[PDB]
Write an enzyme that holds these catalytic residues in place. Structure first.
Site, PDB file in Angstrom:
ATOM      1  N   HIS A   1      -5.439  -9.722  43.517  1.00  0.00           N
ATOM      2  CA  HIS A   1      -6.350  -9.157  42.536  1.00  0.00           C
ATOM      3  C   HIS A   1      -5.727  -7.991  41.787  1.00  0.00           C
ATOM      4  CE1 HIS A   1      -7.541  -6.050  45.626  1.00  0.00           C
ATOM      5  NE2 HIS A   1      -7.643  -5.316  44.532  1.00  0.00           N
TER       6      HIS A   1
ATOM      7  N   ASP B   1      -6.596 -13.327  48.656  1.00  0.00           N
ATOM      8  CA  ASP B   1      -6.144 -12.132  47.954  1.00  0.00           C
ATOM      9  C   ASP B   1      -4.758 -11.729  48.451  1.00  0.00           C
ATOM     10  OD1 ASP B   1      -6.340 -10.027  46.163  1.00  0.00           O
ATOM     11  OD2 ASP B   1      -7.446  -8.747  47.551  1.00  0.00           O
TER      12      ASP B   1
ATOM     13  N   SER C   1      -5.579  -0.707  47.409  1.00  0.00           N
ATOM     14  CA  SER C   1      -5.519  -2.165  47.294  1.00  0.00           C
ATOM     15  C   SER C   1      -4.094  -2.676  47.221  1.00  0.00           C
ATOM     16  CB  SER C   1      -6.255  -2.636  46.036  1.00  0.00           C
ATOM     17  OG  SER C   1      -7.564  -2.110  45.973  1.00  0.00           O
TER      18      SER C   1
HETATM   19  C1  A7I Z   1     -15.652 -10.020  45.045  1.00  0.00           C
HETATM   20  C2  A7I Z   1     -16.259  -9.049  46.062  1.00  0.00           C
HETATM   21  C3  A7I Z   1     -15.737  -9.342  47.472  1.00  0.00           C
HETATM   22  N1  A7I Z   1     -16.033  -7.654  45.645  1.00  0.00           N
HETATM   23  C4  A7I Z   1     -14.620  -7.244  45.716  1.00  0.00           C
HETATM   24  C5  A7I Z   1     -14.462  -5.848  45.109  1.00  0.00           C
HETATM   25  C6  A7I Z   1     -15.369  -4.840  45.820  1.00  0.00           C
HETATM   26  N2  A7I Z   1     -15.327  -3.538  45.138  1.00  0.00           N
HETATM   27  S1  A7I Z   1     -14.020  -2.652  45.547  1.00  0.00           S
HETATM   28  O1  A7I Z   1     -13.420  -3.058  46.860  1.00  0.00           O
HETATM   29  O2  A7I Z   1     -12.998  -2.581  44.452  1.00  0.00           O
HETATM   30  C7  A7I Z   1     -14.655  -0.950  45.768  1.00  0.00           C
HETATM   31  C8  A7I Z   1     -13.595   0.085  46.153  1.00  0.00           C
HETATM   32  N3  A7I Z   1     -13.116  -0.150  47.524  1.00  0.00           N
HETATM   33  C9  A7I Z   1     -11.900  -0.624  47.779  1.00  0.00           C
HETATM   34  O3  A7I Z   1     -11.077  -0.918  46.914  1.00  0.00           O
HETATM   35  C10 A7I Z   1     -11.562  -0.802  49.261  1.00  0.00           C
HETATM   36  C11 A7I Z   1     -12.211  -0.267  50.294  1.00  0.00           C
HETATM   37  C12 A7I Z   1     -11.716  -0.583  51.496  1.00  0.00           C
HETATM   38  C13 A7I Z   1     -10.649  -1.382  51.473  1.00  0.00           C
HETATM   39 CL1  A7I Z   1      -9.821  -2.023  52.851  1.00  0.00          CL
HETATM   40  S2  A7I Z   1     -10.257  -1.741  49.847  1.00  0.00           S
HETATM   41  C14 A7I Z   1     -16.815  -5.343  45.832  1.00  0.00           C
HETATM   42  C15 A7I Z   1     -16.891  -6.750  46.429  1.00  0.00           C
END
Ligand code: A7I
Ligand code: CA
Lengths: 53, 234
Positions: free
Chosen positions: B42, B88, B185
């Site tokens: 991603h 991913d 990420s």
């Molecule tokens: C398609 C679904 C599964 N979404 C993916 C992005 C998600 N948002 S996010 O992960 O970009 C929010 C910020 N958090 C992070 O990047 C991470 C937190 C913990 C890890 Cl491990 S990565 C929300 C759910």
């Protein structure tokens, strides 16, 4: 437990039961020691090692 | 990274940082060898063109050990889906070889079976990166690391508003305010075994950051070991 389930079969890294008994192996950049358990780095900066210098 | 400690000299040598046209780090990566970097699929969409920086711990200075590398080939998993973040994973082939040195070294790739029964059964793993130190904060300038406990798969699924595929796994805490966050990420999730650190996951996603009842979601690296080897052979 037994074999590899018992303290990784005394292996430094990879452990797998082959024909019963234990067989140890190492990641790339390492060579199995004479004792067939320890893994010797084959050069500087072997994978998975924090750097001191 | 929210909470945790900053990586001291030589503690997170396999950490890689992806930078955009503006030399800004948007994602992390893991050094697999002198030519390959492991990252999240991603992340490949958060910048039209990027480079790879290794050996860096403070993005606002110059320890002299930093090194920028250009990407020659980008090998994304053809089954990655933005809808669920499944598959991913991606591998980067660098134009020039990385010179291992202080703060610049690769993490080891384990074997699937041994990894699943011995590494993933350990109490914790370690994630690291230049991501936000708070859900709404900005990218960190100092590289950080955090010890994250493996989470029971059952709890993982029950706690997630999104489907947790078999190419994923949970790590972190239910209520303790420590977790990876936006920016980490594609970064490293490694597990320690007898002083050797093995790549066990890729920082994938989470609902916010460090939220209560939520965990960090990582790409289950052991599920792509063959794919990774294939990617590296060519
Ligand atoms: C398609 C679904 C599964 N979404 C993916 C992005 C998600 N948002 S996010 O992960 O970009 C929010 C910020 N958090 C992070 O990047 C991470 C937190 C913990 C890890 Cl491990 S990565 C929300 C759910
Ligand atoms: Ca620096």
């Amino acid at each position: 437990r037994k074999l590899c389930s018992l303290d990784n079969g005394d292996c430094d890294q990879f452990c797998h039961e082959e024909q019963n008994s234990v067989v140890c192996s190492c990641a790339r950049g390492y060579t199995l020691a004479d004792n067939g358990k320890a893994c010797i780095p084959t050069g500087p900066y072997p994978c998975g090692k924090q750097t001191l210098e | 990274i929210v909470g945790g400690q900053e990586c001291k000299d030589g503690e997170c040598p396999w950490q890689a940082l992806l930078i955009n046209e503006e030399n800004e780090g948007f994602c992390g990566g893991t050094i697999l060898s002198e030519f390959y970097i492991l990252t999240a699929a991603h992340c490949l969409y958060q910048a039209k063109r990027f480079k790879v920086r290794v050996g860096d711990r403070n993005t606002e200075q110059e320890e002299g050990g930093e090194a920028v590398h250009e990407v020659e080939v980008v090998i994304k998993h053809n089954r990655f889906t933005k809808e669920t973040y499944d598959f991913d994973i991606a591998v980067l082939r660098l134009k020039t070889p990385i010179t291992f040195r202080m703060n610049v070294a690769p993490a080891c790739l384990p074997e699937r079976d041994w990894a699943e029964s011995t590494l993933m059964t350990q109490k914790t793993g370690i994630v690291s990166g230049f991501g936000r130190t708070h859900e709404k904060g900005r990218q960190s300038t100092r590289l950080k690391m955090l010890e994250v406990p493996y989470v029971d798969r059952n709890s993982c699924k029950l706690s997630s508003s999104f489907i947790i595929t078999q190419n994923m796994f949970c790590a972190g805490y239910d209520t303790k305010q420590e977790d990876a966050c936006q920016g980490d990420s594609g970064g490293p999730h490694v597990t320690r075994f007898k002083d050797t650190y093995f790549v066990t996951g890729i920082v994938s996603w989470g609902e916010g950051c460090a939220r209560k009842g939520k965990y960090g979601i990582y790409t289950k690296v052991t599920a792509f070991l063959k794919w990774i080897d294939r990617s590296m052979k060519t």
